[PDB]
Design a protein around this ligand. Structure first.
Ligand SMILES: *[C@@H]1O[C@H](CO)[C@@H](O[C@@H]2O[C@H](CO)[C@@H](O[C@@H]3O[C@H](CO)[C@@H](O)[C@H](O)[C@@H]3O)[C@H](O)[C@H]2NC(C)=O)[C@H](O)[C@H]1NC(C)=O
Ligand SMILES: *[C@@H]1O[C@H](CO)[C@@H](O[C@@H]2O[C@H](CO)[C@@H](O[C@@H]3O[C@H](CO)[C@@H](O)[C@H](O)[C@@H]3O)[C@H](O)[C@H]2NC(C)=O)[C@H](O)[C@H]1NC(C)=O
Ligand SMILES: *[C@@H]1O[C@H](CO)[C@@H](O[C@@H]2O[C@H](CO)[C@@H](O[C@@H]3O[C@H](CO)[C@@H](O)[C@H](O)[C@@H]3O)[C@H](O)[C@H]2NC(C)=O)[C@H](O)[C@H]1NC(C)=O
Ligand SMILES: [Ca+2]
Ligand SMILES: [Ca+2]
Ligand SMILES: [Ca+2]
Lengths: 197, 126, 197, 197, 126, 126
């Protein structure tokens, strides 16, 4: 009975997300876990860089990338429109199950709480917080996170939307040529009212 | 049908192709800076005779700059009767007052968002 | 089986909370969701301003308002004493159910973990964090949140207490006359040990 | 059915943790609650100082202490190796139950998501955030929290590890001789992917 | 019964009324700055003969200022034998030492909380 | 068996004792600065004849300093062929360039972690 999790599965073999547009082929490995907890959904997310280009952003003083996630009328990932290029599914050990998703809608960000095109309630479509990139010298580099819950639809298919966006802009880059390695964010957990099944 | 039509506020999802068979569907998505408003379609199917069904990009409206009420003792007027990007906001202060922070703001597109080219002015006593 | 949520329901028609004392009639719309998750309760809360006065605070350089919530010996909102002027209930789609609340006590902040009048454990009655008002120019304005779990009772009826308090005091107000609109906070999720049923 | 919580129980009679090495006998009372929520575990933790020495750290300008928690191949606390000197158990009112723990493994930080000795994924073993010590004059003193999920094992018994570490280093200590009392942190809630049962 | 009694540390919940019928209840709540301590009541019912039952505001104690131990080599003494607001804390340093940061603090009410009018003093070598 | 053996990278869990009975077990734990790597044991039992079974501290490796790639147009070389603490990293810039931020870093132990005694140098044009 793992139908309360709709997640990417733990650390995937190959990259599953293509976050950089200056890119093609899946530059990173996006881990996402939505768990049904009461009238809310617990969103757990972070990213594991895989391609050399993405990994090298840590050497930059001012960055920001976005992971756009669109779902259709049933709660299914729109893969061609989204950054996550491979569907989510229920828990099956540390991996994605392989079958029909039970009540996907239930995991979507409620349109009642987070609407589309309502400028009078726009402010209500945002979630913010902080995650940390843990640098070479072991210091904690804070990264800003903005989250927009389905405010603007992308076409006649996108029934729900979740757009996470990481960013940072300081005096110095969180890394340097000789120390850089992988770009990894710490788990960022946020909450939102869920659509009804 | 040959390469699907192209639009100004809506672009094709995926790489186009020279030829297309009957019953095939092609999907578009509002471009960067635009958004969708039901119920018009953003896709089309290649019918029996190889010419796509009717399709528009009218379901995709431009992002708009935030609202701006009249600066106390003055007036803010949407020069082009719209908040949409690619337009401008003008400010005239009332008779007994004078305008300071100059008095044209341009609602411009920056990335995936429409934003004012600056800040509203204010009116002072004279 | 939505008896694990005791919430205000999603975005209510009319304002349900009266946060400003300089006020009368319900100045805002307080959204609150308590979900039973293990020996803890997940509290999800934020506010939607409705009255012009409350909405205009964003034009002020130093503000702070409190939402006082008192419950009786059974876990029922004391409406006359609280800011939330209308009872909470179980989930029923995006709305409050309409019937007997099953195990309200279970949602209350444990008196064992958060006591009354124990000055030696006072420090243990506090929860802090940050939410964000998303301003006109789209910048994120941080708002400070302090939470006091039933430390001081208000009379012989208040068996439990939850007092949330938002505040901010910077060099500039998060808004200006011409840009102000609605005062909205982002969901602030906190945790606390729950009383036993 | 409280087998979804594996916790220290609410506010224990005697101190249960020995955080200070410059110490012996259990200097504080560590409260810890792990709740199974989906493919994740909700960790809820903070500390209640008990011994005079520990309580007096608040008079220091730069501090930091760690609470090391090791578990064996089955999910059981290694008491001799850990700071928490007394086992965890399921919920039983506000106290620890007294019997066989049902599926302890299930509460452990997944080795798949947080591995051992993998320097290429090291960054993925960290969790950060903030808790607050609420000082005498009622101001909120922020304390930094770093969390390392089982990266380095301590010997052939430690199958999983959870190391929380609080710290602060400012211009002034959060207290002064005449005002000091108890050292208490506010609940710090974090998340992590759980091992499979 | 006529308009319920009024108290100094406890006020009436809701607007009062000129007349009240038998069996009616009226509730109070500790005022701003006070708090409740069981088991005394804070409500009363209008009995058979139209005179409220006995009721006090003794269940409502004043908020207190935080504790203050003696400043090393000196002494802090609750001038009025209480930490409650509306009172004061005094500081006398010991013989061989002298007091610096002056030596009276007033536990005052500020909003809904009792707080010291300042900071404790200290004693130095002389 | 008498007091268990002692090791350099592994220490005894709990206070030692003068005498030990057969079948008793004693456990060690990698010291501060070290870590465990399967599958070697870190414990031992006092057998029939009062001499502990064979036991080592080889399952405990030293903490290592983070990796350091060659400074553009220069070379970083692990002087002692290891990143482990108690050793050093050396930097020689290439022919046409000169080294600035001096050119030895010492991977040292600080608390429970191995860290470089500083920062890598860089090479400039000459
Ligand atoms: C948005 O509304 C504004 C206001 O009507 C439009 O901008 C203004 O457009 C006029 C004519 O299109 C420009 O006038 C030109 O002025 C020069 C000298 O000032 C004159 O020699 C030319 O013959 C011509 O009349 C005017 O410069 C311009 N104002 C500004 C701020 O530059 C604009 O066209 C509207 N936008 C759209 C897309 O319709
Ligand atoms: C709290 O305790 C203090 C200390 O006993 C009380 O304050 C002090 O009260 C006395 C008399 O009530 C004041 O004395 C007056 O002094 C003037 C000249 O100094 C003298 O001419 C008058 O005849 C009178 O004796 C004294 O000023 C005052 N101390 C301070 C700090 O101002 C106070 O009354 C106690 N509070 C309560 C509510 O009992
Ligand atoms: C880590 O590798 C370095 C490099 O090989 C070793 O440090 C160097 O060790 C040598 C000999 O052990 C030291 O040489 C001495 O130099 C003086 C004058 O410079 C000379 O008179 C002596 O006869 C001797 O040759 C050298 O000073 C030292 N380098 C530094 C940076 O001080 C080191 O031994 C290796 N570490 C380990 C644990 O093996
Ligand atoms: Ca068009
Ligand atoms: Ca009284
Ligand atoms: Ca060895």
């Amino acid at each position: 009975d793992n139908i309360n999790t709709l997640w990417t599965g733990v650390n995937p073999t190959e990259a599953n997300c293509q976050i950089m547009n200056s890119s093609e082929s899946n530059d990173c490995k996006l881990i996402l876990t939505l768990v049904k907890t009461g009238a809310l959904v617990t969103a757990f997310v972070y990213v594991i860089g895989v391609s050399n280009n993405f990994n090298m952003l840590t050497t930059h003083r001012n960055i920001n990338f976005t992971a756009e996630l669109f779902f259709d009328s049933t709660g299914n990932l729109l893969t061609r429109l989204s950054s996550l290029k491979t569907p989510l599914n229920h828990k099956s050990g540390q991996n994605m199950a392989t079958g029909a998703i039970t009540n996907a809608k239930g995991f979507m960000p409620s349109t009642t709480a987070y609407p589309f095109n309502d400028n009078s309630r726009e402010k209500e479509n945002y979630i913010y917080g902080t995650c940390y990139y843990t640098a070479s010298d072991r210091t904690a580099f804070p990264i800003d996170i903005s989250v927009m819950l389905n405010r603007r639809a992308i076409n006649d298919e996108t029934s729900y939307c979740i757009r996470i966006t990481w960013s940072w802009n300081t005096g110095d880059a969180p890394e340097v040529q000789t120390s850089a390695t992988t770009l990894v964010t710490s788990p960022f957990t946020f909450y939102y009212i869920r659509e009804d099944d | 049908c040959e390469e699907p039509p192209t639009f100004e506020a809506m672009e094709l999802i995926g790489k186009p192709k020279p030829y297309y068979e009957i019953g095939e569907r092609v999907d578009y998505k509002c471009k960067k800076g635009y958004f969708y408003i039901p119920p018009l379609a953003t896709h089309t199917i290649c019918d029996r005779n190889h010419t796509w069904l009717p399709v528009s990009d009218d379901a995709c409206y431009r992002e708009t700059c935030p609202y701006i009420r009249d600066p106390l003792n003055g007036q803010a007027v949407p020069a082009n009767g719209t908040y949409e990007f690619g337009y401008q906001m003008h400010f005239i202060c009332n008779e007994g007052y004078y305008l300071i922070g100059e008095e044209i703001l341009y609602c411009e597109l920056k990335g995936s968002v429409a934003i004012w080219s600056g800040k509203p002015p204010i009116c002072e006593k004279v």
